[PDB]
Write an enzyme that holds these catalytic residues in place. Structure first.
Site, PDB file in Angstrom:
ATOM      1  N   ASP A 232     -19.974 -39.652-101.358  1.00  0.00           N
ATOM      2  CA  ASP A 232     -19.232 -40.917-101.565  1.00  0.00           C
ATOM      3  C   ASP A 232     -17.639 -40.312-102.158  1.00  0.00           C
ATOM      4  OD1 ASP A 232     -21.614 -43.296-103.188  1.00  0.00           O
ATOM      5  OD2 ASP A 232     -21.047 -42.791-101.186  1.00  0.00           O
ATOM      6  N   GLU A 503     -24.949 -54.709-101.906  1.00  0.00           N
ATOM      7  CA  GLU A 503     -24.648 -54.405-100.307  1.00  0.00           C
ATOM      8  C   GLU A 503     -25.243 -55.575 -99.452  1.00  0.00           C
ATOM      9  OE1 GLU A 503     -23.588 -49.758-100.263  1.00  0.00           O
ATOM     10  OE2 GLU A 503     -25.908 -50.584-100.353  1.00  0.00           O
ATOM     11  N   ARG A 519     -28.793 -56.041-101.457  1.00  0.00           N
ATOM     12  CA  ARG A 519     -29.678 -54.884-102.158  1.00  0.00           C
ATOM     13  C   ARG A 519     -29.263 -55.128-103.450  1.00  0.00           C
ATOM     14  NH1 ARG A 519     -26.875 -48.721-102.011  1.00  0.00           N
ATOM     15  NH2 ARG A 519     -27.985 -48.099-104.082  1.00  0.00           N
ATOM     16  N   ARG A 581     -35.976 -43.299-100.141  1.00  0.00           N
ATOM     17  CA  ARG A 581     -35.470 -44.005 -98.943  1.00  0.00           C
ATOM     18  C   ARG A 581     -35.939 -43.528 -97.797  1.00  0.00           C
ATOM     19  NH1 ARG A 581     -28.703 -44.234-100.456  1.00  0.00           N
ATOM     20  NH2 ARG A 581     -29.027 -46.163-101.659  1.00  0.00           N
ATOM     21  N   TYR A 615     -29.440 -45.953 -95.084  1.00  0.00           N
ATOM     22  CA  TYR A 615     -28.404 -46.882 -94.604  1.00  0.00           C
ATOM     23  C   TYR A 615     -28.568 -47.188 -93.134  1.00  0.00           C
ATOM     24  CZ  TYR A 615     -25.429 -47.545 -98.781  1.00  0.00           C
ATOM     25  OH  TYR A 615     -25.166 -47.707-100.070  1.00  0.00           O
TER      26      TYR A 615
HETATM   27  O1  LIG Z   1     -26.639 -45.681-102.744  1.00  0.00           O
HETATM   28  S1  LIG Z   1     -25.473 -44.635-102.243  1.00  0.00           S
HETATM   29  O2  LIG Z   1     -25.215 -43.768-103.591  1.00  0.00           O
HETATM   30  O3  LIG Z   1     -26.252 -43.888-101.250  1.00  0.00           O
HETATM   31  C1  LIG Z   1     -24.037 -45.370-101.542  1.00  0.00           C
HETATM   32  C2  LIG Z   1     -23.045 -46.279-102.515  1.00  0.00           C
HETATM   33  N1  LIG Z   1     -21.654 -45.927-102.177  1.00  0.00           N
HETATM   34  C3  LIG Z   1     -20.906 -46.906-103.210  1.00  0.00           C
HETATM   35  C4  LIG Z   1     -19.392 -46.664-103.090  1.00  0.00           C
HETATM   36  C5  LIG Z   1     -18.449 -47.591-102.518  1.00  0.00           C
HETATM   37  C6  LIG Z   1     -17.087 -47.224-102.543  1.00  0.00           C
HETATM   38  C7  LIG Z   1     -16.648 -46.291-103.150  1.00  0.00           C
HETATM   39 CL1  LIG Z   1     -15.084 -46.025-103.506  1.00  0.00          CL
HETATM   40  C8  LIG Z   1     -17.681 -45.103-103.862  1.00  0.00           C
HETATM   41  C9  LIG Z   1     -19.083 -45.648-103.770  1.00  0.00           C
END
Ligand SMILES: O=S(=O)(O)CCNCc1ccc(Cl)cc1
Length: 658
Positions: A232, A503, A519, A581, A615
């Site tokens: 991320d 989400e 979620r 997942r 996802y």
């Molecule tokens: O659940 S996961 O860690 O696979 C993905 C979550 N991503 C969230 C997120 C959304 C925007 C920013 Cl800038 C940083 C992180």
């Protein structure tokens, strides 16, 4: 070239098949290639497909094997105790198990090249690892080999790593076949790649897939093009898009819908060792989490995504600051000039950089691409590249000039280090994208923005209403536009959580009636209901019959156009698992036309309960098939970071789901 050995129709039913007399004497020279077509829809935890061993007493660690795990990981071992060599290479999530209730035929190619001293593995066309060693061990120079085995490794007279499955075909060559030669081997893939390593994005990784069916029949997809491994933000990430004009059969070469150029588009093999895998690009601007909708009225395609200034992600994003200044009803983007410790500037009309302290305009302007000009002259910064040459992540100036952008680390004027949302539009259904524009703050001036829910926006069937879901702590905030995305208003709906990654994806059960699935942190997917086109929202409920982990996973959802068993139908895509997942499913729900409740009647297994599913994106293709683009791996697991080509696309029909 021709094989030294070839066999097939081997049933592996927890009993090894001996092929010593057929193979061992044919092995010669120090380079070998293995090509193996195999199935395994119920593998044991750990099992060897193929083995070469010294089976004699006192040499239990003298062997070569190709093995797989019930998680879908593939690997090899190359071991010789006299030599002091114990090679073990693998990659998680390399395999398919089942598809449409039928065991998938995997095509494995392993190349042991003594010239280049490299071990390379491909599965289903995709390179999963390539390891160079200082001290090469050819797979039949192992001290005292006397067995060749299928479905186990013969160690000291006994069957280790017993395999359950089948090998339709196995071929062996006394040569290291070339990469170009590997690509001529026919495949039986149940999936397609839309975005892949080596395409026009030059990103080695991809996350956060979307799909949306446009009125012309074209199917559009957007995705995170992730450069700095699969991390991320903070990172380098662009938003890329592709489309199919033939119901998902072929896909256009990707373009960018949103991109920054402060860092090079490098195709980097990100380190997967425990020491280095958390290496994260730290000075780049990025985009993350895109969402698509189509506007009937204008014909525009609209895409939103989160925008991060240099080095920002959701953990360091300046909370308590929107990044805009409100001046009598109007929001203006704030800027800090290098050398000041405070934010003294705002971007006013026509991009005029205005000094809030002296209350005068400056000689600086901001253009449409958020680039800095002085007296109309374009300013520049030097671009950064990343490398691991010195044994740790290095981010450094690469010698070339790019337009100075206020989201950049090196920019003379800088935006507030927080999270933003931007929108771009297309007038030609994804052939090109307009320069993005930031959306205004919705939760006030002294509050950091929301986060966009990746996937699809919602186009209400019976109006011009556009809705994108977004989240922040304690609520879903819906962005609403009735004028083709020109203006947006917010609609807040409270959720019983603090600090979730909520989400959310929406469906219209019927005119004016929206159900949103999101979620949570509870182990269950939630939903809420609006009966006034998203003006107001019901309290929160939960779905039984599906499990998520405590941290959850994005869920995608659509309203299916055709009746199923005579009822209106909804389809959900989600892992079904309390463990990780994995265990991907499309779940089919029939709507009770009397009370809008939903009967979750069919659960379709995408692949094995233990194979990864994260996802996802679903769309009804124009021919009424279902298109699925998904992360085929565990994108939470710290063991499965930085895998290439695991975001995959498949085609299903309703009959497959039922
Ligand atoms: O659940 S996961 O860690 O696979 C993905 C979550 N991503 C969230 C997120 C959304 C925007 C920013 Cl800038 C940083 C992180």
């Amino acid at each position: 070239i021709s094989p030294i050995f070839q066999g097939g129709s081997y049933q592996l039913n927890n009993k090894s098949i001996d092929i010593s007399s057929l193979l061992l004497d044919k092995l010669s020279g120090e380079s070998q290639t293995v090509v193996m077509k195999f199935k395994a829809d119920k593998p044991n935890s750990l099992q060897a497909l193929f083995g070469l061993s010294n089976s004699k007493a006192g040499f239990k660690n003298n062997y070569f094997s190709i093995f797989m795990r019930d998680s879908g990981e593939i690997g090899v071992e190359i071991r010789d105790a006299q030599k002091g060599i114990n090679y073990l290479f693998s990659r998680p999530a390399s395999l398919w198990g089942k598809h449409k209730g039928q065991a998938v035929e995997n095509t494995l190619v392993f190349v042991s090249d003594s010239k280049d001293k490299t071990y390379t593995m491909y599965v289903n066309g995709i390179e999963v690892f390539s390891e160079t060693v200082d001290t090469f061990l050819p797979i039949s120079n192992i001290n005292g080999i006397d067995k060749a085995t299928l479905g186990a490794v013969n160690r000291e007279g006994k069957e280790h790593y017993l395999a359950k499955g089948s090998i339709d075909e196995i071929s062996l060559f006394n040569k290291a076949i070339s990469d170009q030669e590997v690509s001529t081997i026919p495949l039986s893939n149940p999936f397609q790649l839309i975005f892949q390593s080596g395409d026009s994005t030059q990103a080695n990784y991809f996350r956060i897939p979307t799909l949306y069916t446009l009125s012309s029949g074209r199917v559009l997809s957007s995705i995170d093009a992730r450069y700095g491994g699969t991390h991320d933000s903070k990172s380098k990430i662009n938003i890329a898009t592709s489309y199919s004009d033939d119901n998902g059969k072929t896909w256009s070469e990707p373009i960018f819908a949103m991109k920054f150029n402060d860092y090079e588009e490098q195709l980097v093999y990100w380190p997967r060792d425990n020491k280095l895998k958390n290496s994260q690009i730290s000075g780049s601007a990025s985009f993350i989490d895109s969402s698509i909708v189509e506007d009937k009225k204008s014909g525009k395609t609209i895409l939103l995504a989160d925008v991060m200034p240099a080095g920002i992600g959701n953990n360091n994003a300046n909370k308590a600051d929107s990044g805009f200044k409100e001046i009598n009803g109007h929001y203006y983007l704030k800027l800090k000039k290098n050398g000041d410790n405070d934010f003294r500037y705002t971007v006013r009309e026509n991009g005029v950089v205005y000094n809030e302290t002296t209350n005068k305009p400056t000689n600086y302007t901001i253009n449409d691409k958020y680039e800095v000009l002085e007296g109309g002259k374009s300013l520049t910064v030097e671009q950064y590249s990343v490398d691991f040459d010195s044994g740790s992540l290095r981010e450094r100036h690469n010698g070339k000039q790019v337009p100075m952008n206020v989201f950049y680390k090196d920019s003379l004027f800088k935006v507030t280090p927080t999270n933003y949302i931007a929108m771009t539009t297309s007038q030609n259904r994804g052939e090109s994208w307009e320069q993005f524009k930031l959306l205004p703050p919705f939760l006030g001036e002294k509050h950091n923005g929301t986060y966009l829910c990746p996937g699809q926006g919602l186009a209400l069937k019976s109006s011009n209403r556009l809705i994108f879901a977004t989240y922040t702590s304690g609520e879903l905030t819906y962005l609403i536009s009735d004028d083709s995305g020109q203006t947006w208003k917010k609609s807040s709906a409270s959720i019983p959580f603090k600090n979730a990654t909520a989400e959310a994806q929406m469906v219209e059960l019927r005119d004016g009636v929206i159900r949103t699935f999101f979620r949570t942190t509870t182990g269950k997917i939630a939903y809420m209901t609006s009966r006034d086109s998203g003006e107001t929202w019901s309290k929160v409920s939960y779905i039984d019959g599906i499990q998520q982990t405590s941290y959850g996973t994005q869920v995608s959802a659509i309203k299916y156009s055709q009746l199923i068993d005579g009822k209106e139908a909804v389809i959900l895509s989600t892992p079904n698992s309390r463990s990780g997942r994995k265990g991907g499913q499309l779940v089919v729900g029939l709507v009770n036309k009397e009370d809008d409740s939903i009967d979750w009647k069919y659960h379709y297994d995408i692949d094995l309960p233990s194979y990864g599913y994260a996802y996802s994106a679903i769309t009804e293709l124009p021919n009424h098939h279902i298109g699925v683009l998904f992360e085929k791996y565990d994108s939470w697991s710290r063991n499965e970071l930085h895998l290439s080509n695991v975001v995959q696309y498949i085609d299903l029909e309703i009959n497959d789901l039922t």
